[PDB]
From a paper:
As several SpoU MTases acting on specific nucleotides of the 23S [name], [name] is a dimer and contains, in addition to the [name] catalytic domain, an L30-like RNA binding domain.
The structure of the enzyme from HB27 and HB8 differs by only three amino acids, and apart from the slightly different orientation of the L30-like domain (see below), both proteins are identical (Root mean square deviations are 0.690 and 1.472 Å for TTHA0275-MTA and TTHA0275-ADN, respectively). The enzyme crystallizes as a dimer, the asymmetric unit consisting of two dimers. Dimerization involves around 1535 Å2 interface consisting of CTD α-helices α7 and α13 of both protomers, organized perpendicularly. The dimeric state, confirmed by gel filtration chromatography, and the perpendicular interface organization observed for [name] are hallmarks of [name] enzymes acting on the ribose, in contrast to the parallel dimerization mode adopted by [name] enzymes acting on the base. Except for a slight movement of P188 side chain to allow a CH-π interaction with the adenine, no major active site difference was observed between the [name] HB27 apoenzyme and TTHA0275 in complex with MTA or ADN.
Author numbering:
A (entry chain A): 1 to 260
B (entry chain B): 0 to 260
């Protein structure tokens, strides 16, 4: 069926999913863009409703897998979309309720722990790098919204691709100690170069937000503190960039490379 | 004390117009925002024409003026001129510098980054911060790429002032590399060598195209080796600035004693 009026009750409800409070109440979230819908489906997330605009391809309709397919008019589409140039494919997926307690880590895991909230767009970039390097788990700050239009768009759907859990600092500390994982803190003044850590047997990298840096409690908790060399005028890199360097160094060692 | 209070003051409007590249071209001037960015421009020998100080500037911020005109801005006048939600309290209007590629001398085994095409100012800025961090000897960017936008300056943390970055033409870039006798390493998603497998101990020019388009086939023919960043999940691409940082720090790893994979 099709819905024409932007004022239709179903459309208003779809547009309301732009707000975190409405997503948490209804248990649904909107995924905008063909690429992002593909990743949410490939990740096995439960599609409830597929929204198709006027210029969608025929292959787009076959993505529904039996879910409701609602064709929306451009006027209706404009209201639902979080974009200047709305996408022709959108999906309403069920919001997953997941607990860090349900997590069991495979062999020699690569874990990234982000402490504190970081500038917008940093998380999306980090998830892309984490997805690329094959990270097994990413812990983020307790207040992080993993289902916002922003994180979905900035991660290009990589947010769906891996286990990401927003947790309080104390929950993170407890989980890591339970897992008996060596903690490696990335700090500007770390005693060792980050190439020199041994990441072949599994590791949790500790990474702080630019505003405050790593709390001293976490620096002390680390088995090793490591640094990224800065040989120029700049004294630090963006936290997302630091994350990518660490992850790909750990992947380099898992691919046959030796610690420096 | 020369004070500007109203966002309606024509000078404030003119200062705010410097955000646009056309205005920078016409005036031959650009705005540098931030005490640390201003000091860096000054350390790099750039010419300061006008120092801007907000209501919360330090007393010693005045000691940066040299011979420049000093303008004290109200809080709301500062908000109009600034490119940030939380404006800096020290800003400087400098003369656009003239960069000559001829005076660049490279030693043996230099680390070079060649950025073909364009993307956003945020991306270029972050690439320059990584080049500064990794100690690149030279960065070449596409021909009409803007090195002195507020974004580039902010995202580079002012590293754009002391870093050897040059706007250059595709053919000029190609010839210069040929003149320098540097092996070209093209970073592409299709390359059949992981980037850790290249040997960057003796010098290298990395070739990086925009994430959207890619790399022109004329440049793909000039590459000695083609390398990729490995991608272990569904995505096969990362932001271009992230790829640049990964390549540069892999060369630095090898230069610090690490061996190619």
């Amino acid at each position: 069926m099709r819905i024409e009026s932007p004022q239709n009750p179903r459309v208003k409800a779809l547009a309301a999913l732009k707000e975190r409070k409405e997503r948490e109440r209804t248990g649904r979230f909107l995924v905008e863009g063909r690429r992002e819908v593909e990743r949410a489906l490939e990740a096995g997330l439960s599609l409830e409703t597929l929204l198709l605009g006027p210029k969608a391809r025929p292959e787009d309709r076959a993505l529904a897998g039996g879910a409701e397919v609602l064709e929306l008019s451009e006027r209706a589409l404009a209201r639902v979309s979080a974009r200047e140039n709305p996408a022709q494919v959108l999906g309403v997926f069920r919001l997953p309720r997941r607990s860090l307690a349900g997590v069991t880590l495979g062999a020699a895991p690569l874990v990234l722990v982000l402490l504190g909230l970081e500038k917008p767009g940093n998380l999306g970039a980090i998830l892309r790098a984490a997805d690329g390097a094959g990270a097994d788990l990413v812990l983020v700050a307790e207040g992080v919204d993993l289902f916002s239009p922003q994180v979905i768009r900035n991660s290009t759907g990589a947010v769906f691709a891996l286990p990401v859990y927003p947790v309080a600092e104390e929950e993170a500390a407890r989980f890591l100690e339970e897992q008996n994982l060596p903690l490696v803190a990335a700090t500007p003044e770390g005693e060792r170069l980050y190439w020199e850590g041994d990441y072949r047997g599994g590791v949790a990298f500790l990474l702080g937000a630019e505003d405050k840096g790593l709390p001293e409690a976490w620096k002390r908790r680390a088995q090793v503190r490591v640094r990224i060399p800065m040989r120029g005028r700049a004294d630090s890199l963006n936290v997302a960039v630091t994350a990518a360097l660490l992850l790909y160094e750990a992947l380099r060692q898992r691919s046959g490379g030796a610690p420096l």
